[PDB]
Amino acid sequence: TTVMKFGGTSVGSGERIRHVAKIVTKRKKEDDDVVVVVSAMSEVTNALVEISQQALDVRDIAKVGDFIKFIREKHYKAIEEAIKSEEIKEEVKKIIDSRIEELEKVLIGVAYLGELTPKSRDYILSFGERLSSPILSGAIRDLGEKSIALEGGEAGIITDNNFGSARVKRLEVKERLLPLLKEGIIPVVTGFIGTTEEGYITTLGRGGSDYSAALIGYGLDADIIEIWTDVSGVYTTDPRLVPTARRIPKLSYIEAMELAYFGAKVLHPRTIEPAMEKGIPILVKNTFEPESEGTLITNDMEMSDSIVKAISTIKNVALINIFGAGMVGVSGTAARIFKALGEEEVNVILISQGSSETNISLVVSEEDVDKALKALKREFGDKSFLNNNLIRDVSVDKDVCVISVVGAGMRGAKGIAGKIFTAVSESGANIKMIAQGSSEVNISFVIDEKDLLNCVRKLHEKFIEK
Amino acid sequence: TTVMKFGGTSVGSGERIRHVAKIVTKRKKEDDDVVVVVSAMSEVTNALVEISQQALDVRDIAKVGDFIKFIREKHYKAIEEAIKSEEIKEEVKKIIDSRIEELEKVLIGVAYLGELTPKSRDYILSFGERLSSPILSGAIRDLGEKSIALEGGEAGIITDNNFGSARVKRLEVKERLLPLLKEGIIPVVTGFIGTTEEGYITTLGRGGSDYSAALIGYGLDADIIEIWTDVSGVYTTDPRLVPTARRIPKLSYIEAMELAYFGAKVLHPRTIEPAMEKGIPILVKNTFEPESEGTLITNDMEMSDSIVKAISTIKNVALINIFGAGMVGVSGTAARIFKALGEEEVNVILISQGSSETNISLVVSEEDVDKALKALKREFGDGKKSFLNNNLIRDVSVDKDVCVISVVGAGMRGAKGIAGKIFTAVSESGANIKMIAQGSSEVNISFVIDEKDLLNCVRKLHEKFIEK
Amino acid sequence: TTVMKFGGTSVGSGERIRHVAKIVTKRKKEDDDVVVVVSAMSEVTNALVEISQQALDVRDIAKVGDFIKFIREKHYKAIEEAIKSEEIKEEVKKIIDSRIEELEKVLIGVAYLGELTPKSRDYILSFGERLSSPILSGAIRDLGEKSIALEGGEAGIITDNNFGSARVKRLEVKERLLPLLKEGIIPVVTGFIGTTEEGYITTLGRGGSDYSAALIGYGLDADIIEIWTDVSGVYTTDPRLVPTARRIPKLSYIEAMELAYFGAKVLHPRTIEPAMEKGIPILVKNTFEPESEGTLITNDMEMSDSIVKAISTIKNVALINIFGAGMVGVSGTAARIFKALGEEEVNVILISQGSSETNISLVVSEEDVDKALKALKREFGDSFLNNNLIRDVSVDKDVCVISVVGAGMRGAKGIAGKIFTAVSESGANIKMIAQGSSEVNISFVIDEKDLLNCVRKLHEKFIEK
Amino acid sequence: TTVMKFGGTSVGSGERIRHVAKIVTKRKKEDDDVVVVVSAMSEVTNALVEISQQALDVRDIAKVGDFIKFIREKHYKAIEEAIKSEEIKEEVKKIIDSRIEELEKVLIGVAYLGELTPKSRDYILSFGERLSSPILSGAIRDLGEKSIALEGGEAGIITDNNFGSARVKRLEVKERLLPLLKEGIIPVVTGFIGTTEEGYITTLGRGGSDYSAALIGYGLDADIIEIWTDVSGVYTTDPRLVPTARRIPKLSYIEAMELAYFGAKVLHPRTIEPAMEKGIPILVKNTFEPESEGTLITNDMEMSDSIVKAISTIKNVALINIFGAGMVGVSGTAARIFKALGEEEVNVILISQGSSETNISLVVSEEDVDKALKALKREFGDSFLNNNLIRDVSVDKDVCVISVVGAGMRGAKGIAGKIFTAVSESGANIKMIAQGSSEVNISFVIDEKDLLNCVRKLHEKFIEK
Ligand SMILES: Nc1ncnc2c1ncn2[C@@H]1O[C@H](COP(=O)(O)OP(=O)(O)NP(=O)(O)O)[C@@H](O)[C@H]1O
Ligand SMILES: Nc1ncnc2c1ncn2[C@@H]1O[C@H](COP(=O)(O)OP(=O)(O)NP(=O)(O)O)[C@@H](O)[C@H]1O
Ligand SMILES: Nc1ncnc2c1ncn2[C@@H]1O[C@H](COP(=O)(O)OP(=O)(O)NP(=O)(O)O)[C@@H](O)[C@H]1O
Ligand SMILES: Nc1ncnc2c1ncn2[C@@H]1O[C@H](COP(=O)(O)OP(=O)(O)NP(=O)(O)O)[C@@H](O)[C@H]1O
Ligand SMILES: N[C@@H](CC(=O)O)C(=O)O
Ligand SMILES: N[C@@H](CC(=O)O)C(=O)O
Ligand SMILES: N[C@@H](CC(=O)O)C(=O)O
Ligand SMILES: N[C@@H](CC(=O)O)C(=O)O
Ligand SMILES: [Mg+2]
């Protein structure tokens, strides 16, 4: 049993989709049990996001009409450049047309009403994967192989109704997919999406097609999860930021999860958990360079001579400093802070507290800042050591980034902290926050956004290039 | 208005008590309004803690009487060696006797009942100061000046009834002391203690005689709060760990507060709060070197060339690592963690979170580990792991063989290069950093290392940043 | 300052709308300061509810089209039948046409989107009053008097945004209406709608047009609030259940409120609070029998010889019995039960608890049963040695609540005995009793099938003696 | 396997203790597996309660000394009058002396410190059973039988640390007692007490000795639990209130549990659950009339013609009326009320809600009134446009709860009518009714002064006929 997941650029044109179909069909000969997971064509999820908000805010029906045309022309072109059979192209076009009509009505409804609920937002977003998967499945059929396209819920991924990033509730993957695999059919499953218990389409979070692959692998007790992307594995850093980045042949589950979580886009952080608890290896491969060995992700852990295998960053974060009202009790005041933040579903990335004033430092997603301050005003409302006030003030610095350094044995490595932070200084970066102790393999810290490149480059020179 | 506080060693013997009385009476001829705060004689609060526990655990009444004779003879000897007047010795002796009768009555009651409530414990501990204040007062009277001994509550410190570490609710310092300063009386006030609203004696936490002084100073709008200890101010580190520790002439409120809070025993961390919010300057002085300038703590803040002015430690802490169940939401699971700990009144010193598994690192006071472990089991109900399962916490580990080291100075957080310099120094000392806190304080960086490596680490940091 | 509210049947045709405008213009000559509150025409709110559900569920645009034609034809007919002046008819028709357009757009939007939010439902429902109010207003102008139609929000009713049942947050009634009355104009204000702080149209709950009148009366410091309906005041019970029901000339504020709350449709329960707050009397009158004295509602209270002055019923309820796991602590499990139910916004009507097993009986709205069950599932999950609080839960939907009301109830000796022997003499079996928490009300639960008989028997013994 | 529990009056003197040892010794010959549970001698627990408070409030040491002499003389007399053997008397007196020594020190501690925590009370209270059990065990040994006295904790009863009314956590009975029974030993276990996990003595609540018997019975899978008291079973009401009370030969678990819970002092309410869940019969017998059949409590349930087999009362209760701020949401305001009361461990006995104002009626223990008022003010603090939940709260302590119990109560047509007309003819005025939540029980509140007359009237009507 092999699950093969392909990303947006891997299916970014018809030529590409057909290439992907050939990779799948070749694997089919080695392992007769193949499930494919597929994302939306490159950039369409982004376009779906922007048109939803345009349809909501400006409410312009010509603008929606232009989007539809672009989406139609792109997927028609894909079909024509991916499939040779007239019969198959015709049946794929029929499905794409059906989805496009459905897409159009909903977008017009949003504009008529000036209303876009999280539920409707998830539904619109689902169209990306639901437009690409019939094409890939058709292209596999065109190559003489049995195939059908399926949505994530009907493939067995059941979630709660937290539209935006629904958590997975239940898996019916074996029930839904085993009958298909037994008839020798290659199911092409939509990434990114699941289903609510009542059948409402749900998304799993941006990047979530990787997670779908792991969920389907876990559910089927798969032999391997193959992540097919546009780089040859996980690298020592984002190869788009630092050209001298190197492929890491082997990574542990925890190393990989920490890297993904702290900004390595190649893997959605939630990909690791299901594979990890069933011991299913993950292989990250390049669809544009299929002979490359990529990165194999397993339980195997080895330290490297220098301690730091990789560097990741998150840019879309803010630094929130809460000022305490003196020695008012750190556990009592944190309890109320995090109650408020939790109630509001604010995503906190990093926590530090070491202050007689009961100040606390927090990194949150930049989009969650207003929700955080909102939540904090509700909790504490609006001085003196004799009153019962816990909080004095709050400051937020949005012009900031989190940099994380990851390698086995990190926490236990003597001298590594010193080496990290003197290097950070030498790049010209000024450290606003540090987190160490809660991870076996990770050190994270905050610097000014402007210094991100110089800092990553210097860390890369010191630890990877030597 | 000047308030002078004297520590246990400063009043460690009758001779020492008189020397202290002399210091005060020399100040009364510079400032007419002098209020004294005094601690129990050296080592007696500890003795009281230990006899309390013994009266509860072994319940031997002959063993109580052995302690009563020790306290009697120590305070009698002190009266003898502090005061020259026979009338005053007789006067002070009666007060001491009356306190000893009450002490014995309660230690026996605890042995009879077999129960020691925080209320009873707070009463027992208050005897340290209620025995020393009349002796010092008597010594001041002996040097020809008016003086009476007072307890914290009747000096105007009102608290809640959280016996052990009562928080100050309310101040009546001016109401209580003004009529006495007005008549030229030097009140000798018991540090460490205050009163519940219905009159029950309460303690303010260990080391809280420094805090009493600040509360009185605040209550009086005092011109200066003088802390008289057994070192010539606040030093670059503990002079007993590092003999080459240097006196720091000047310190800002926030620097001293962070130092005290992270292990500088010279000041109880709560001392700064009331002084700072009225701008009352704190002078830390040596009773055994009264000519020394000491340390002056004010709003004045000045960066040191080598950022890092002082180094402090806490030994009596434990490192608790909470292992999360995966990506389960840090704020939500932090909310539940800190609720449980807050409910149990667990003292958390340091927090660090940076983990895809929702792990969190915690430093707590060492004696709160059982409370914390208890609180978390109630909160989370101990199973798993499954990503489909709704559990939040996978496991918990504690390491009590740990210490926290803190490094303090005006430009700390804003200073480029300092963290790397600190942590390379820490490694050069042989230590393995288990936790780091940076960001939440302007002047402080704290980290956790193995307890065995404490001295060497402090030595290396003091070498690199202070000595040169 | 007189506020006059007219119901759906009272403005249930063009002819009736003109008769109403004739009552209003007659009042204007006694009180120069008159404000009209008007409901949607009879049955249109109901039709609006069903077309919303239809637009969401099947999503047929042609069925929406058929509805727009019904709502247009209905209201065009009314304009032609209420107003003489051709100019005013054309004036009122343009207002109606603008509303229909807005209505059509939302209903198409709902069908295209496949989602009907509470915000969208409230907007759709509001069209009823927003269509009927300019027809009444135009008819008032057709009788020679100055008038304009306003919405509840623009007339000063500001609410939170709990769409469907929004709570009144703030009033600007005096501020917006006083200038209109200063010029001699008669405002015709829409009944069950308010506005959010940002101008979103909100509804006040079914029946809420009576509540608007009380709200407008309160804000204006009115001298009287007049409720015009199709019965001559509050009766000893529903005259549709019992032909021989009697008009009650006078009722106290608390008596009226308990009756309404426990099912006397003539008044929305929330009508009483604003009135009672400022001691503004409420007069309930029959538009079809205008010379009847009807019912005067004030602070005046007086016991009947036979305590028990009225009987009310609620049919659309369920009896929920929660089975405790033994002596597990009543206030603690009660805490978790009502937390869960509060969280799910479940409407509980009645609570009884008196059980060594920590059992508890609840009456809830029949439409709240699924929510309620779901909440208790989420809350409780799933020996005397484990910590389980709940054993099981049962629901009986084939149930009704009957309430008896009159001054002196709780304090009158023997009345509980007389009530329940009567109930028994009707053939009914009592499933739950509430007594103690009201000075003026006793409530109890029986099988739905015994409703009419029990009401009749109660009316026999206590009213017709 | 038989558990035999004897109450305070049953062991209220030395002659009585010896008579009890004879009943146990007779049973021993029919069933070799006998465990005895015993209470403190009559009135001793109350004496311990009063001298505790005196030691706290007045702190007179010679007054404690007078108590010690009273306790010593009583128990020395019981020893002399119960046991013939000098050697056993000597051996029991030595045990009694250790306890009295310990008891005297504790009470002197209380006066010295001027403090009495719940932990200390339980410890002091436990001395009653720890003083009588050695005497009874001595008397059993005096009659040629092997016997040892044991405390509840060491017999296998482990509780949480809720001193005063600790909940049973864990039972270890088989483990501790089975080895004793196998050697022919009759364990005499102190009723009323358990042990915290770390060894602290805990009480199970007043009346708790009955509960101990059921716990021990459940723990051993006993064939029967014998509750030996000073009446011949459970009666139709308290025979001390109504001399014409009749013994009820047979009761179901639920009938006996509801009655106990609602005031039938003969059984602690928690007695029934452990027996019920293992189907162990409870036989209630008279130690002064051992030949009477008593009352047998099992699963068997039978309706009586008059439905109402028994009337119980609770006197030490208060009626709390919480006044709501209006139509503010009952589930939501109920949520906050029961949270506050649950947090303060307030024992609520009865609940009724049925009010348009969100009023709620509550019956709580009379001792808990201040707890409840303090918690309510902590929850809510001190216009309809205001998000207020609670207007006010009044308490009435001059109140009692009356409960009527019998199989088929809830499903019986006409019974409520009959009950409440009877209440009226007693001259009582009903302040609260609870019905619905129990299959076998109807409860209501009246003025405390009307209690005797109400019970008598109910008894006349339903029992005597
Ligand atoms: N440490 C890293 N190693 C490798 N690639 C990285 C790393 N960090 C960031 N990246 C970037 O991650 C990209 C792959 O992620 P992504 O753009 O999501 O492709 P995908 O997952 O195949 N497509 P989709 O399924 O539509 O999200 C690469 O193009 C890299 O630029
Ligand atoms: N940074 C520091 N500077 C100076 N002294 C320090 C520092 N850190 C720790 N110490 C120690 O703290 C001691 C003073 O504290 P302590 O003995 O409690 O003072 P005290 O207030 O005079 N006595 P008491 O009032 O009974 O607590 C000194 O003797 C030092 O050994
Ligand atoms: N005790 C009662 N007294 C009088 N009428 C009652 C009573 N109980 C129920 N009703 C019914 O209540 C009806 C009046 O309310 P109803 O007509 O439904 O509201 P309305 O205010 O007149 N119109 P609308 O504004 O659209 O609600 C009467 O037709 C009666 O059938
Ligand atoms: N319905 C009832 N039937 C029988 N007795 C009742 C009833 N209601 C109350 N009682 C009283 O309950 C008393 C028995 O309980 P109680 O006085 O606790 O005896 P005990 O349990 O044997 N002694 P102790 O173990 O010290 O509590 C009887 O004397 C009756 O007066
Ligand atoms: N297509 C989705 C899911 C994914 O790319 O993994 C997104 O743009 O986020
Ligand atoms: N409170 C006194 C006594 C003590 O804590 O030991 C002090 O400041 O030291
Ligand atoms: N027309 C609205 C308002 C009312 O009837 O009072 C409704 O049907 O509920
Ligand atoms: N002796 C205890 C226990 C009992 O009587 O059952 C009491 O007085 O309550
Ligand atoms: Mg991706």
Ligand SMILES: [Mg+2]
């Ligand atoms: Mg000190």
Ligand SMILES: [Mg+2]
């Ligand atoms: Mg109506």
Ligand SMILES: [Mg+2]
């Ligand atoms: Mg009893």
